[PDB]
Amino acid sequence: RQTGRGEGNFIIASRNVVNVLASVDTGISYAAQGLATGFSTDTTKSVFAGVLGGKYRVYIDQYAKQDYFTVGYKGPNEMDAGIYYAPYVALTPLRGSDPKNFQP
Amino acid sequence: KSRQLKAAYSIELAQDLRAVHGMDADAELSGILATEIMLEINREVVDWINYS
Amino acid sequence: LSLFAPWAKMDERNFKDQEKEDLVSITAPKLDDGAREFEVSSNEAASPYNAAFQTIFGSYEPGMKTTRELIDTYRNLMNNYEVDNAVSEIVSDAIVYEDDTEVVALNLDKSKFSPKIKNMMLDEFSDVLNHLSFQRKGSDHFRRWYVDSRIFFHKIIDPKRPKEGIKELRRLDPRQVQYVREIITETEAGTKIVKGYKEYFIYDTAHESYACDGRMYEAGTKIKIPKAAVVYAHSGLVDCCGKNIIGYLHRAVKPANQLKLLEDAVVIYRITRAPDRRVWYVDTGNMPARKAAEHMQHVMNTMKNRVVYDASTGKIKNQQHNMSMTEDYWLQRRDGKAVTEVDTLPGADNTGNMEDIRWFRQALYMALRVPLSRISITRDELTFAKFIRELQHKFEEVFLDPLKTNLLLKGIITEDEWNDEINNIKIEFHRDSYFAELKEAEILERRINMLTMAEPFIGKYISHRTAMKDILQMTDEEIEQEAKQIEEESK
Amino acid sequence: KFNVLSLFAPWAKMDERNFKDQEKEDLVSITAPKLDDGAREFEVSSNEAASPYNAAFQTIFGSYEPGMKTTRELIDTYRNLMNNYEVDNAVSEIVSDAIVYEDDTEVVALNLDKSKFSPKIKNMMLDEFSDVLNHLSFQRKGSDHFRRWYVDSRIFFHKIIDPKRPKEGIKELRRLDPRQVQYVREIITETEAGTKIVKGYKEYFIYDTAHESYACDGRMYEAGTKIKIPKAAVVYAHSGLVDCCGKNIIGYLHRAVKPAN
Amino acid sequence: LIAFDICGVQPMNSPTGQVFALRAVYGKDPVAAGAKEAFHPMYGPDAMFSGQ
């Protein structure tokens, strides 16, 4: 509504939130929970837990300071994202030596 | 009953737009105006439903 | 519009079949050519509401707008000199007629359910070519198509007695027609399921004024026509992006225009500066403007050559005397110095060497898709023939579409049958018998000459069956048939 | 992973099997990439205590995407060369000779004159082959497919499967749009002083979505993201023509671009 | 916009049209204060009319 550009489609959240998402029945059903199986909770392998309900790409913030989640929207374009990064120079190495002693 | 609106524009604006976005801006305005009318009527219907 | 409801019914069923089958897990849309893109979830089909407005408007204000410029350009090229002959020759070879011969004709040489069906198709075909008035207009339809690369006809139906509804169709104008497709289906991070596209048309009148100064009042148009409702064919020539279909003459636009421009340059050069050109000069300083004028007028209005060649007749205006052997003129010198004078300007000297035109003209002809034989069997003529066949194969859809339409609409065949049967049931075009005979004649002479050479060894090292199948290229059946006919003739 | 892109689940399985076969190979003690042409390889070096592949990731991401941009410039040019006189015909003549097709002639046809399990298979193979051609509408558009291969330097198609009963529900191909697919190879392996391993490479491809209008380029944008899809899902071929080095594949008309201009 | 699938349209080929309505009535005077309708979805009750 607020953006006028489309329904939120991703969430980045704390470990606790993720653990819940993976341990409950996210579909429409009477009631349910159990061991987490629903998504990937292990930051060792990914940051992407999976897609919640088939609607929100859900990711995990391994550095969350306390406990929260952020929901947001990104459109098919790169401009329609709210937040953008625009590299000019990237991963550019510097190389040489110091002639005094040739240390690299 | 009627509905209608005008474009309100000039040449210098178009010249700038040609340079800036590469737009003719005439159709842009027409489409906008068309859009407003259709949306407004749509509201007119919904609102009268709510009214009545 | 209720006017096309029966055609909509057909499109809806076709769309349903696409939905029925698992035509899914597709990224780039399953589209080769034609219609311009749009995407929306299921909408209100009652009328072309804003989603359609924007689609059409988007297809018309930045779309048809320049399409029209291109088609008009294609037509301007078509109507120019020399280039039009190229078109004529192309059109003529594709569409020919001959005394008491066939015209385009359906070749039912494949397995079919029954000969009675074959006969129905032939009759349906005949009605179709008559609907198109092929025998009088096939050349015109083909020509417009070649030039524009798109041809459309309005499809007729009763529809209370739809079985009897096929009738002479109405060819629609380029510049009034647009191809439109829409995707209605959705998946995560982009739609990758049955994107049926529909691929329908938009057609209107509106600003019918360009090469003809038209008159009309303001009105909205944008009519939506079901795919099933229109007969149409187009070229395989498309621009760098989108589905913008271009003319067979597209290749020639560049050189056609620069050639004309160069020709004008030659023309202007030859005309400008042709007549005598001179400036009478006099000193008029420190004189009133209306006094200064007298020095000039005393020369300018007196030393004028009033004798003029009349372009309209073999005579010179005001010439009498017959012709002076001398043109006598003067200027007075009021100052005590050689001050006044008259100068001439450079004339239309002969500098050509009109060689660029030849270069450009030849390059253009190549751009026009013609053999270099234009101003025996050769590579260019064969290539050209291959070209004509492909053009006709595309054009041909103009018959196949209304043919399958009435066959199915009446109920003779089913859609399933059409699809299994074709599998290439081609409509042949008539071929120029004179040239065909010449080609065959060359081939025959070549076969005879080779046979003659083989002959001395044909009874000992090389067999007769071999010479017949490899040198004369006869089939085994052909040979047996010839052996039987020979025996009959002998006895 | 959870295979979010369910679109290619059966193709993913095909790549997994081939990848596993490579893992089981003795192709080790190899310093070379073991590559000649096609998909663009790079040092996505992992499964070792150094993790250098991160630089490789960032390189692809941060620099997105001169590979495909150059490819576009080349293709767009190729089309623009074809648009002129003589080039136009040279292409046509070549395409025609490559695929000659006339009334009652032979089409490209699978000639199984070599040993096979059974004549029954020979017929099955030929019947499938005919359907491949039918899928391609070869008898109507074989010329267009070839022309693009020749001119744009490459041809490629998306393969379509069911997916419920994927070995049965096998459908016709969708000719993919030139300039929209990046083919890649990832060196996911490492050892003493650099990899000398099999380097299976996966050899998958990535589809860049795009929706150009009257832009005649990605004037405003193409369409955001690209999807990484298993190689089993794409039919592709290309000319044996490259730039001075790398997988910088060029078209047949590239050689003429200098004098063409 | 929810254009017109939630309302009627009855498009016209002219401005300013008209619509007719029919009601069954009783009491010998269709146009009167106190006149009664014969049929109505919220009541159709008059079981005493032809009767007692």
Omega before C321 within 30 of 0, i.e. cis: yes
DSSP 8-state code for residue E49: S
Residue D55: what are its φ and ψ, rounded to 5°? -65, -40
As given in the structure block, the two tokens for residue C44 are 């209100």
Q: Give yes or no for a contact between C25 and D163, defined as CB atoms under 8 angstroms apart.
A: yes
Under 8 Å between Cβ of D85 and C367: yes
DSSP C392-411: HHHHTHHHHHHHHHHHHHHT
Among all chains, which residue has been given the structure tokens 């499967």? Answer: D161
Measured in degrees and rounded to the nearest 5, phi and psi for residue D119 equal -50, -30
Task: Give every CB contact of residue C374 below 8 A, 6+ residues apart in sequence.
Answer: C86, C89, C365
Distance CA D161, CA D172 (A): 9
Structure tokens that stand for C256 in this block: 């056609």
- For the record, the structure tokens of B51 come out as 């009214």
How far does chain D reach from its first CA to its final CA, in angstroms? 50
- C200: nearest Cα among C403, C4, C376, C396: C4
Residues 6+ apart with CB under 8 A from B5: B33, B36, B37
Q: From C433, C430, C432, C441, select the one nearest C376 (Cα to Cα).
A: C441
Q: How many Å apart are CA D197 and CA D191, to the nearest integer?
A: 8
Strand runs labelled E in chain D? 40-42, 154-161, 170-175, 181-186, 205-208, 226-229, 234-238
CB contact under 8 A, D229 and C27: yes
Helix (H) or strand (E) run with residue C309 in it:
strand C308-309
**DSSP for D1-67, written as a single string:** ---S-GGGHHHHHHHHHHHHHHHTS---S--S----SSSEEE----SSTT-THHHHHHHHHHT--HH
Contact across the interface for B46 and E4, Cβ inside 8 Å: no
The residues near C477 (Cβ < 8 Å, ≥ 6 apart) are none
In chain D, residues with a C-beta closer than 8 Å to the C-beta of A51 are: 2, 4
Closest listed residue to residue C73, CA positions, set C219, C237, C257, C222: C257
Q: Which two structure tokens, joined as six digits, stand for C318? A: 């005001």
What one-letter code names the amino acid at A1?
A: R
Q: Does C50 touch chain E (CB under 8 A)?
A: yes
**D32: buried, middle or exposed (CB in 10 Å: 19+, 13-18, 0-12)?**
exposed
Residue C421 φ then ψ, to 5°: -65, -40
Whether E1 contacts chain C with CB within 8 A: yes
* CA pair distance C222, C177, nearest whole angstrom: 10
> Which residues have C-beta within 8 Å of that of residue C404, sequence separation ≥ 6?
C413, C418
D221 touches chain A (CB under 8 A): yes
Q: Is B30 on the interface with C (CB under 8 A)?
A: yes
Distance CA C227, CA C233 (A): 12
Q: What's at C314, amino acid-wise?
A: G
DSSP, residue by residue, A41-79: --TTT-SEEEEETTTEEEEE-TT-SSS-EEEE---SSSS
Contact C178, C64 (CB under 8 A): yes
Triad D49, D54, A60: Cα angle to 5°: 100
Phi, psi of C201 (to 5 degrees): -120, 155
Query: Which run of H or of E encompasses C232?
Result: strand C230-234
SS3 D154: strand
Beta bridge partners of D227: D207
Sheet strands side by side (includes C150-154):
C170-172, C150-154, C230-234
For residues D173 and C26, what is the distance between their CA atoms, to the nearest angstrom? 10
Strand partners, C179: C201
Nearest-5° Cα angle at B43, B40 to B46: 155
CB D48 within 8 A of CB D200: no
* Polymer length of chain E: 52
- CB neighbourhood size of C472 (10 A): 15
Place of tokens 């034989």: C373
* CA distance linking residue C281 with residue C295, whole number of Å: 10
Q: Which residues of C186-213 are buried (b: 16+ CB within 10 A; e: fewer)?
A: eeeebbbbbbbbbbbbbbbeeeeeeeee
**What are φ and ψ of residue C238, in 5° steps?**
-130, 150
Interchain contact C318–B (C-beta under 8 A): no
Which residues are CB-neighbours of C480 under 8 A, at least 6 positions away? none
Amino acid identity, position C51: A
Q: Dihedral angle at the C-alpha atoms of A50, A56, A58, A61, nearest 10 degrees?
A: 170
- Helix H or strand E segment including E36: strand E36-37
Amino acid type, C129: L
For C163, C490, C491, E48, the CA distances from C486, given in Å and listed in that order, are 53, 6, 9, 109
A33 sits in which H/E element: none
Q: Tell me how many degrees the CA angle C216-C219-C225 measures, rounded to the nearest 5.
A: 110
- Identify which of E7, E6, C51, C182 has the alpha carbon closest to the alpha carbon of residue B38: C51
Distance of CA D254 to the CA centre of its chain: 19
Task: State the Cα–Cα distance between residues C343 and C367, nearest whole angstrom.
Answer: 48
CA–CA gap between residue C435 and residue C441 (Å, rounded):
10
For CA atoms C225, C227, C231, C234, the dihedral sign is positive
| D207 closest CA partner among D146, D150, D156 | D156
Strands (E) across C142-199 are located at 150-154, 170-172, 177-180
* Angle at C293 (CA atoms; ends C292, C299), nearest 5 degrees: 115
Q: How far is CA C193 from CA A70, C22, C55, C189, in A?
A: 30, 8, 21, 12
CA A10 to chain centre: 8
Would strands D181-186 and D40-42 be described as parallel, antiparallel, or unpaired? parallel
Q: Residue D61: which of D75, D44, D73, D47 has the closest Cα?
A: D44
Tokens, residue C264: 């004008």
Of all residues in chain B, the one with the smallest CA distance to C48 is B38
Which residues 1-52 in chain B show a CB within 8 A of chain E?
38-39, 42, 45-46, 49
- Category of C222 on φ-ψ map: left (φ > 0), alpha (ψ -120 to 50) or beta: left
| CB atoms inside a 10 Å sphere around CB E31 | 6
Quote the CA–CA distance of B3 and C268 in Å, as a whole number. Answer: 56
- What gap in Å lies between CA C153 and CA D226, rounded to an integer? 41
C-alpha to C-alpha distance for D201 and D198, rounded to whole angstroms? 9
Task: Answer yes or no: are the C-beta atoms of C328 and C307 closer than 8 Å.
Answer: no
Contact D223 A77 (CB under 8 A): yes
DSSP 3-state assignment of C174?
Answer: coil
- Nearest CA among D229, D226, D109 for reference residue D159: D229
- CB-based burial label for C46 (10 Å; 0-12, 13-18, 19+): exposed
User: Which 8-state DSSP code applies to residue A10?
Assistant: E
Instruction: Give yes or no for a contact between C252 and C154, defined as CB atoms under 8 angstroms apart.
Output: no
By what technique were these coordinates determined? cryo-EM
Cβ atoms of C84 and C146 within 8 Å: the answer is no
- CA-CA distance, D121 to D127, in Å (whole number)? 10
Mark which residues 44-73 of D lie under 8 Å from A by CB.
Answer: 55, 58-59, 62-63
Q: Nearest CA of chain E to the CA of B49: how many Å?
A: 9
Strands C230-234 vs C278-281: parallel, antiparallel or unpaired: unpaired
C36, C42, C48, C49: CA torsion to nearest 10: -120
C347 Cβ partners below 8 Å, 6+ apart?
C273, C274, C275, C276, C277
Q: Which among D211, D256, D253 is positioned nearest to D75, based on CA atoms?
A: D253
3-state SS, residue C1: coil
User: What is the C-alpha separation between C480 and C165, in angstroms, rounded?
Assistant: 50
Q: Do the Cβ atoms of C248 and C89 come closer than 8 Å?
A: no
The string of DSSP letters for C50-118 reads HHHHHHHHHHIIIIIHHHHHHHHHHHHHHTSTTHHHHHHHHHHHHS---TT---SEE---S--S-HHHH
Helices C65-78/C83-94 angle, 10° precision: 90
Written as six digits, the tokens of D232 are 């089993």
Contact C46 E9 (CB under 8 A): yes
| Dist CA D106 CA C182 (whole Å) | 38
Report the DSSP beta bridge partners of residue C67: none
Which distant-in-sequence residues (6+ apart) come within 8 Å of C14 by Cβ?
C227, C228
Render the burial of C439-460: b for 16+ CB within 10 Å, e for the rest: beeeeeeebeeeeeebeeeeee
Distance CA A39, CA A58 (A): 9
Please report residues of A whose CB lies closer than 8 A to that of C189: 57
**Look-up: residue for tokens 């992006």?**
C241
- Burial of A73 per CB tally in 10 Å (0-12, 13-18, 19+): middle
How far off is chain E from B46, nearest CA to CA, in Å?
9
Look up residue C435 and give its amino acid: F
Resolution (A): 4.5
| List of chains touching A (3+ CB pairs within 8 A) | C, D
DSSP code, position C259? H
Q: Which of E16, E52, E22 is nearest to E39 (CA)?
A: E22
**Beta bridge mates, C172:** C152
Residue of D nearest to C425 (CA): D103
D164 by DSSP, 3-state: which?
coil
Q: CA C308 to CA C319: how far, in whole Å?
A: 7
Residue D155 phi/psi, 5° resolution? -130, 140
| Rounded Cα–Cα distance for residues D72 and D78 (Å) | 9
Tell me the pairing of strands C230-234 and C150-154: antiparallel
Tell me how close the Cα of C220 comes to any Cα of chain E, in angstroms: 14
Strands C308-309 and C278-281: unpaired
How many contacts, defined by CB atoms under 8 Å, are there between B and E? 13
Written as one letter, the residue type at C152 is F
CA–CA distance, A50 with A52 (Å, rounded to integer): 6
Q: Is residue C470 within 8 Å of C451, Cβ to Cβ? A: no
